[PDB]
Design a protein around this nucleic acid. Structure first.
Ligand code: MG
Ligand code: MG
Ligand code: MG
Ligand code: MG
Ligand code: MG
Ligand code: MG
Ligand code: MG
Ligand code: MG
Ligand code: MG
Ligand code: MG
Ligand code: MG
Ligand code: MG
Ligand code: MG
Ligand code: MG
Ligand code: MG
Ligand code: MG
Ligand code: MG
Ligand code: MG
Ligand code: MG
Ligand code: MG
Ligand code: MG
Ligand code: MG
Ligand code: MG
Ligand code: MG
Lengths: 149, 77
RNA sequence: UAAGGUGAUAUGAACCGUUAUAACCGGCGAUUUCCGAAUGGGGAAACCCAGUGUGUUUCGACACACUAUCAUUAACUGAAUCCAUAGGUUAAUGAGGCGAACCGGGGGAACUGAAACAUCUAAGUACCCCGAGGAAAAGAAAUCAACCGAGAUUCCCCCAG
RNA sequence: AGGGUGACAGCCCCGUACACAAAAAUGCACAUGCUGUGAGCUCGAUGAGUAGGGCGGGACACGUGGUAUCCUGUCUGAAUA
RNA sequence: UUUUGUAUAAUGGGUCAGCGACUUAUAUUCUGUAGCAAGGUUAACCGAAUAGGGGAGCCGAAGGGAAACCGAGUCUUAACUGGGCGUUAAGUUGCAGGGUAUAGACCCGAAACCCGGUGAUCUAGCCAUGGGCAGGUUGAAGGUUGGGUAACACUAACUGGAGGACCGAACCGACUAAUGUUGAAAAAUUAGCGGAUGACUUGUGGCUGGGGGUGAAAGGCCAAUCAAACCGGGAGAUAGCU
RNA sequence: GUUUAUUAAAAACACAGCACUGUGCAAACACGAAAGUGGACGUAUACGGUGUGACGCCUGCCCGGUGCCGGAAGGUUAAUU
RNA sequence: UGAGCCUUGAUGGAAGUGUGGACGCCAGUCUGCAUGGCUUUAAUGUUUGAUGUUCUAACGUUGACCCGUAAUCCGGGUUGCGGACAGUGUCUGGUGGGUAGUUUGACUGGGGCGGUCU
RNA sequence: GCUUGACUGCGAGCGUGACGGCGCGAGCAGGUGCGAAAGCAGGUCAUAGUGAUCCGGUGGUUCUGAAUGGAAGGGCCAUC
């Protein structure tokens, strides 16, 4: 008696896993109550794909749209000013709520929630590293150029 | 009627034939116990006078698979 | 088919006939009370009581028809419980019981013999029970053979006391 | 052949071989009509709580015997051309 | 007939007439007889059915050895001796008879064993529902009044009416004797006798079924039957006995 | 009171009383393969089984044997593995 | 708590200074814990065997309700109770005149007793 | 004193039994012992000291062995 788990189950749970059990547990509890399904094959060797449609198909080539990675590299230059002045300083600041919306009229657009940056550059003007990573794995790169009004 | 109902295992006769080989016409009756099977699909708890091992059948050849038959033969169910 | 006939102990009576159904022989139908599976209910068999329709009618009471049970199916209903089943109703179709032997199956003696008696025999016999047919069962190799091959089953004669 | 007729009859009678005979009803063969049935052509698929096994019994001529094989009440339980 | 032995006072027979017991089948061995002969002969089956065909197969012509094997020899043995069993034996198939085997096996006969049914209108318990008990006797408990007591006890008279109580018909039963004993009768008659409001007695119907019932228990009763009913089977049980 | 209907009515059986013992209720037990039922529509002041046999005075010693009751620590030990 | 697997020790970061355990043939030395110039044998992961607890979800219920149903049976549902116990099937040790089939010799100056069977 | 003849295979022919059996046995073959040698020895002076068959157990053997080679088992010989 194998049967595949369907939820909790103490020393043998996986919301979906085949584990050897006693028939005194099935047709008595593990089943009659909705907590398992016999190794009827029709749910294993005929459901393998079904019970594997997030790895063998998704997590491995999942290109649903996670192309927003390096996607940003050849654009209209990610020059994001910040109002400079005062003996060669600046006025405001640049971080996320500016790099993302930058592609406003550009039709496209990036999520300021998807980026990589160790610390936060103080008042300068050098290219920022607001790298726009579409997903943890596949990241990217983004710059900044504090121009002058 | 001490019948397996699911496999039909009926009580057969025999001889206890004690040491020295002595005729002792007896009988061997099935295990049987009658259970409360959960058809689930039909949402019913049909109770059948099933016999040991004969149960391993329902738990192997299928519940509603067996319930299918037995019901085709015209048995209670 | 025919000159004779109305069965017998049975005459008599009273009649039918003699070309062409008078009688009589066969085919087919009609009628076919009451009991009896007996089936509307009940019951000491051949009897007692009822319902729903129908009928006569100067339309009462009483005659007649249908009303068992189970099962398969269809339809309508329909509990605990929303559903849903269970259960109920109806309709149709089938069953029911009787049988001589042979047949398949479920159960299965003892006397007896062994010069006693338990193993063993009697014997899977007697008997009991269910089921089927004019036959039943059996039957197209997970068979045998023995290095050649045979080729489903069933009955007969050998092998062989 | 046989039977009867007042004793034992081939030719007295009934029969007897032989030859025919059916409105209808049906057993059976064929012959076909209606419904139901499904032919053959390629590509397939080839019978799991089963076969075996432990326990107890039973059938095999065969009294478990060194005893195959078959059926199983009880527990198990595989391969898969 | 049975016996050592029977007139036997041992058995059986009243008599008559009719019936009444060594058969039948298959197999095996002989004897006789017929056929053929180192060969004899078919089975089922076919069938212009007692023919004819069929020789499947059976017996015999070879035997010894536990066999392998050998063979007029072979075993035993290490033994090329002796000794055992063989070789100079005609068989075979019908038909009739004698004998055996398996059958009921000459015939009649148990007491019993097993299987399935039928019986509680008799009887034994019980269940339900109805009926019966002439007369006569005894006099318990309880109560009422007097007494009495501190009140209770206690006491007397009356009252009251109990009881597997008493005497005794019906009724139920059955201790004694006589008669009956081919009875009036397959258990009674007659003269006495026991209980008779009780574990009483009785009508009606019902329930217990055989290795089972029922039993105030005797092995008693379960239809004139009981240490296992009756009827029908197994069944022609078996019978070294008569 | 009962009893051998048909040879024994008794000193036999039965009885009320006695003791022992079992039974917690789905009771013990009995009929029945089972369902079910009697026990009992009762519940230990109850029911069953055994023996004794009103009542009065009593009922001694024996637990080695058999049975039964309690212990089971250890020895021997079934199927099974 | 046995037995197992073998997963980890013991033979076969900086000195000192101390804190519990080890069998020793001891005059021991080890072994860890802080502070500080492959066998031979035990623990965690694990498997299985034992006993014992607790649970529910089989299983029981001759508790109480509801419907079938103007039913005491029965079935389904609800709830309580008990609960892997009890119970049953197969196997198995014990017990077992309750029941059943049988046995329980012969000679013998009748039988038995005694004695005797070669 | 020296030894293992209480040997192995057979056996003319006898005795005694209903039979199953049982006893006597000269001599033949192979190999032993004892004696110088003839020769004696196949258990004891002799007659009691005993169990059939079956079912099996142990050793031996190309006897057999169910398609073949094996094996189990079976036979033979010894033996309980
Ligand atoms: Mg009627
Ligand atoms: Mg009727
Ligand atoms: Mg005999
Ligand atoms: Mg071939
Ligand atoms: Mg005399
Ligand atoms: Mg004489
Ligand atoms: Mg005389
Ligand atoms: Mg005469
Ligand atoms: Mg009186
Ligand atoms: Mg009188
Ligand atoms: Mg009186
Ligand atoms: Mg009466
Ligand atoms: Mg007979
Ligand atoms: Mg007779
Ligand atoms: Mg008296
Ligand atoms: Mg008398
Ligand atoms: Mg008397
Ligand atoms: Mg007494
Ligand atoms: Mg006394
Ligand atoms: Mg005393
Ligand atoms: Mg006895
Ligand atoms: Mg007998
Ligand atoms: Mg004698
Ligand atoms: Mg001597």
């Amino acid at each position: 008696m194998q049967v595949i788990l369907l939820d909790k189950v103490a020393n043998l749970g996986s919301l979906g896993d085949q584990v050897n059990v006693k028939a005194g547990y099935a047709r008595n509890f593990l089943v009659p109550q909705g907590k398992a399904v016999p190794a009827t094959k029709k749910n294993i060797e005929f459901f393998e794909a079904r019970r594997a449609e997030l790895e063998a198909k998704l997590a491995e080539v999942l290109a649903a749209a996670n192309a927003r990675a390096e996607k940003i590299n050849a654009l209209e230059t990610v020059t994001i000013a910040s109002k400079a002045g005062d003996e060669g300083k600046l006025f405001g600041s640049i971080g996320t709520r500016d790099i993302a919306d930058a592609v406003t009229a550009a039709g496209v657009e990036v999520a300021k929630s998807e980026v990589r940056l160790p610390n936060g550059v103080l008042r300068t003007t050098g290219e920022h590293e607001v790298s726009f990573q579409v997903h943890s794995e596949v990241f990217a790169k983004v710059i900044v150029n504090v121009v002058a009004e | 009627s001490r019948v397996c109902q699911v496999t039909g295992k009926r009580p057969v006769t025999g001889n206890n034939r004690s040491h020295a080989l002595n005729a002792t016409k007896r009988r061997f009756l099935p295990n049987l116990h009658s259970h409360r099977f959960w058809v689930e699909s039909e949402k019913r708890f049909v109770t059948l006078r099933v016999s040991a091992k004969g149960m391993r059948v329902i738990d192997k050849k299928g519940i509603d698979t067996v319930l299918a038959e037995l019901r085709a033969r015209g048995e209670k169910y």
